RNA sequence: UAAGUUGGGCACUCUAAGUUGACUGCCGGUGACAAACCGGAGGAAGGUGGGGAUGACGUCAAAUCAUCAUGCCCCUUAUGAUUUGGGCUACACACGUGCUACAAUGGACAAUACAAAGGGCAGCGAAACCGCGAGGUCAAGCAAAUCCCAUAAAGUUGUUCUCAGUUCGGAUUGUAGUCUGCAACUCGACUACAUGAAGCUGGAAUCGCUAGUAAUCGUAGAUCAGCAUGCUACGGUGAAUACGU
RNA sequence: AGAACCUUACCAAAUCUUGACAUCCUUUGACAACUCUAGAGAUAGAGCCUUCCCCUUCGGGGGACAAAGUGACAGGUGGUG
């Protein structure tokens, strides 16, 4: 479950810190599979690589029921007719 | 006084049956049989030794038994009692051979073979 | 061919109780089955107070069938051991199918009613009689 | 393919638990015994060969 | 009903009455019998003045009238409002931890 | 294992078989007024004859020990009579259904006794 | 499978193990070290046709015994080559060794020797049939209670996998008091692989 | 002595290696007198006592070039390959296996008993403390008949639920925590709380079991840094059925 | 007989082409532990250190390689039971 507090990658954090000191940036190329929701990612945007192409998704103010690891299933159409 | 000895080995249960003079009764691990062996009103079989062997003079029993289930332990008492009756005097050896319960039953749980499952059931057949 | 029968019984008076404790021993558990059949013993000795031996003997002497069947159907003479076994199996089947409230009210009602030579036990008895007598056309 | 797996499991790993105990003589990925570092079939092959001093089957 | 919530079976034991509707539940039976003393005295409703003296206080913290309903409603509102990375799998019957659905019968699904 | 053809062969073989067994088997001293019924396999190579005899459990045995010898004559004449290509081998067996059916009528007494 | 190498069942009853050492939980190290010497054996195999080796592990020393096809040059003229083999083994296994070369049984009645012989004969473009006839002839001349050699694969430069067997005498396989020698070999010239399993039954 | 912890012996059991023993080896009968068959005595083992490995010739152009090797054809600045995400597991679905319930022989609560086998050196975590539990923390002994994993469940002793979609039932999701993993989301397991669908023994068809048997209820091992409704091994209760082809 | 990464054979991206790995020739040699930086990581630049350890009669071998050239090549979970 949860260990070492919130789990990060310690290098995407460097990029977000560098781009957050000035006016916030709405473009961030990343992988975002070893990161969790925490208040320092508010107001930014992330392009999570689901496996074919990373797609930007903007951070909202209500990140309690969502995680930035995945925004859409890597199974496109979820392997079903409907 | 004199004390005879017998043993019962069946269903991986060994009872070190020791026979002593007295009214005729048992002490399984220095305890009574009724509550030690759960739902064991079957002591009729356990006292069948007294009803069919050596007239009906009951002989006190002291038993130290470990291993196997409670029913297997109970039947293991019978073998030790029968052995003690045998070694008391050979007169009833033939009668015990003719009264049953003397030939030790080698029937214990056997091995598990591949193909069985949680229920010991062979695999099914390719139906439909 | 061998049967591996068991002689002794906690209640020595009747040896059919061995078959009883064996068949009611479902799901690999013996203690509670023996407990509930003792409860049936007690209640049948209590309701219409009499020794359970007589009522049980009436049940095991009136519900015994003489007509069975072994794409052709033929009546066949029944061996006494198979007849008693089938009777006891039907008794436990009635116990299961009745599905009454208490542990043993169904069992005691079954044995008492079979002793009365009435009820679903004799209904199944006459079903066996008439179903087998319908098959007599293949006897010749 | 596995020709680069034989070295990848031998090359550096990003963290503590990143490897698998593959066979040494064989390259079979799955069904390996960690006590011998050998796959399922290699153990049988050497046991039929009598290399290990362990006792034979049918002892129970 | 009278004690709390919406309706309570009549002439029944308390342990099932408190769990007939959204409420304390019967998994907390050990905790409630350790804290409170109102239990199944007998299978009928024997609610007297001595009864309900402190069981209402013991269960007071468990406000269950529409609390679970509002919690679930806001959760699904966030689900279908915010990006539905879980909402997409909530239509097919998959939990947060996954189900690997293969035998999709007509219970959860249309 | 049975076809209409086997049934016709059985009927027409029964008619001739009863005739021969009671009108041409002289030599066996134990002749018996018999009734018969015959069944065959689908391929007409095997035939079972079922019959009844009058007498004790030594007279049925004498008659059987006589039928056993006479089988050759029966087969010869039967092949000399019928158009069928392959002579089925013949074995003679009592029709136990006669006694079994009679025992089948026996328990009828039990049903009528308890209800009266 | 239907047929399994019988020396697998034979070992542990009448015959000793192929490799022997003291017992401990560190069997992985011992086996992975022994595999290196087993693979190194091929260097002496390719010239002396050594049947097999029994390796022993003393308190801190290693003892081996090879069954060479001829001892004259494996022992050298006066020990001109054993020392370098010992040194190479010491370097490769990171531990010393005590080589004790013993010549295989004087008669070429063993299994692996003749298996390699017929494998090389096939690889040298010689009729497997005539080679087998010579092998069984000298096998019965030398005296053996039972001997069979199977072959499989694309024999005689063909494209069909056929199998042949040429046995002689009483050969009890299901019997356990047999004391047999199962062998194997691989041979080819330009076509796939052609496996041969020679079986020897010497005494009961 | 709480307790085989201690002094004393290996008496019993148990414990591993030699030795008798069930081999037709004796009797009576049957059988062409023979082989053999039946019954018996002795006898634990009576007609090979039981269980397990050993699977003839071969059949399936059965499976494996993906353990490995392997002849040939092809790419060999890609048909080789370093690193990051997933994916083999998606669902209108069907399939077969396996697990869980449809129950009051039952469920729920409380005291209480019987087992063997396997692994263990940095692993097996004695006792104990804390916590809502998972588990957190400290901590004994042990290269093993010493010590641990680890308690056996059903069952015995009393009670309750009283025939309902049930004090049956946990599918479903949500809330807050635990072990391991830097990481538990496609993507581990467990816990405390709530929610409570179907299912009230299942139609034609259909599989399994011949005695310590099924069925049932527990235990251990590997798979693993952690993750078994799968597998193997061990243990407990324990029946009728085969007249007959 | 263990699918979150490694695991995996596929796709996308960052990417090299005697290649990821390994051997044969030579320039030669105990194989680089840790940090800063560009980079999603790889990888790369460096600071730093890997660093004759065994025989060494002074070489050399081997013995690992730090990087390089070389022709083979290696390689295919590419195919064919």
UniProtKB/Swiss-Prot annotation, chain A:
GO MF term (any one): structural constituent of ribosome
Keyword Electron transport attributed: no
Stored Pfam families: Ribosomal_S19
Source organism per UniProt: Staphylococcus aureus (strain NCTC 8325 / PS 47)
Lyase among keywords: no
InterPro entries membership: Ribosomal_uS19, Ribosomal_uS19_bac-type, Ribosomal_uS19_CS, Ribosomal_uS19_SF
Protein's GO biological process: ribosomal small subunit assembly; translation
Cellular compartments per GO CC: cytoplasm; small ribosomal subunit
TM region positions: none
Family as reported in the entry's similarity comment: Belongs to the universal ribosomal protein uS19 family.
Function: Protein S19 forms a complex with S13 that binds strongly to the 16S ribosomal RNA.
Name of this chain's protein: Small ribosomal subunit protein uS19
Listed PROSITE patterns: RIBOSOMAL_S19
SUPFAM superfamilies named in the record: Ribosomal protein S19 (SSF54570)
Keywords, in A-Z order: Ribonucleoprotein, Ribosomal protein, RNA-binding, rRNA-binding
Swiss-Prot record, chain C:
Keyword Magnesium tagged: no
Signal peptide interval: none
Gene Ontology annotations for the cellular component aspect, listed alphabetically: cytosolic small ribosomal subunit; ribosome
Pfam families: Ribosomal_S7
One GO BP annotation of this record: ribosomal small subunit assembly
PROSITE patterns: RIBOSOMAL_S7
Keyword Ion transport part of the UniProt annotation: no
Keywords: Ribonucleoprotein, Ribosomal protein, RNA-binding, rRNA-binding, tRNA-binding
GO function terms (MF aspect): mRNA binding; rRNA binding; structural constituent of ribosome; tRNA binding
Oligomer status and interactors: Part of the 30S ribosomal subunit. Contacts proteins S9 and S11.
Family: Belongs to the universal ribosomal protein uS7 family.
Stated role: One of the primary rRNA binding proteins, it binds directly to 16S rRNA where it nucleates assembly of the head domain of the 30S subunit. Is located at the subunit interface close to the decoding center, probably blocks exit of the E-site tRNA.
Name of protein: Small ribosomal subunit protein uS7
Encoding gene, per UniProt annotation: rpsG
From Swiss-Prot, chain D:
One annotated GO molecular function: structural constituent of ribosome
Native species: Staphylococcus aureus (strain NCTC 8325 / PS 47)
Protein name: Small ribosomal subunit protein uS14B
Described purpose of this protein according to its UniProt entry: Binds 16S rRNA, required for the assembly of 30S particles and may also be responsible for determining the conformation of the 16S rRNA at the A site.
Entry binding sites for Zn(2+): 23, 26, 39, 42
Entry-linked Gene3D superfamilies: 30s Ribosomal Protein S14, Chain N
InterPro entries: Ribosomal_uS14 (IPR001209), Ribosomal_uS14_bact (IPR023053), Ribosomal_uS14_CS (IPR018271), Ribosomal_uS14_sf (IPR043140)
Record keywords: Metal-binding, Ribonucleoprotein, Ribosomal protein, RNA-binding, rRNA-binding, Zinc
Keyword rRNA-binding: yes
A Pfam family per the record: Ribosomal_S14
Cofactor(s) this protein requires: Zn(2+)
Keyword Cell membrane among UniProt keywords: no
Co-factor binding comment: Binds 1 zinc ion per subunit.
Summary of subunit composition and partner proteins: Part of the 30S ribosomal subunit. Contacts proteins S3 and S10.
Protein family according to the UniProt entry: Belongs to the universal ribosomal protein uS14 family. Zinc-binding uS14 subfamily.
Example of a GO biological process term: translation
GO CC annotations on file: small ribosomal subunit
Domain of life: Bacteria
Curated annotation (Swiss-Prot), chain E:
Span list, region Disordered: 90-110
A GO CC term attached to the entry: cytosol
Highest rank taxon of the organism: Bacteria
Keywords carried by this UniProt record: Ribonucleoprotein, Ribosomal protein, RNA-binding, rRNA-binding, tRNA-binding
GO molecular function: rRNA binding; structural constituent of ribosome; tRNA binding
Pfam families in the record: Ribosomal_S13
SUPFAM superfamilies assigned: S13-like H2TH domain
Subunit structure: Part of the 30S ribosomal subunit. Forms a loose heterodimer with protein S19. Forms two bridges to the 50S subunit in the 70S ribosome.
Purpose of the protein: Located at the top of the head of the 30S subunit, it contacts several helices of the 16S rRNA. In the 70S ribosome it contacts the 23S rRNA (bridge B1a) and protein L5 of the 50S subunit (bridge B1b), connecting the 2 subunits; these bridges are implicated in subunit movement. Contacts the tRNAs in the A and P-sites.
Sequence similarity: Belongs to the universal ribosomal protein uS13 family.
Identification of the protein by name: Small ribosomal subunit protein uS13
Organism this protein belongs to: Staphylococcus aureus (strain NCTC 8325 / PS 47)
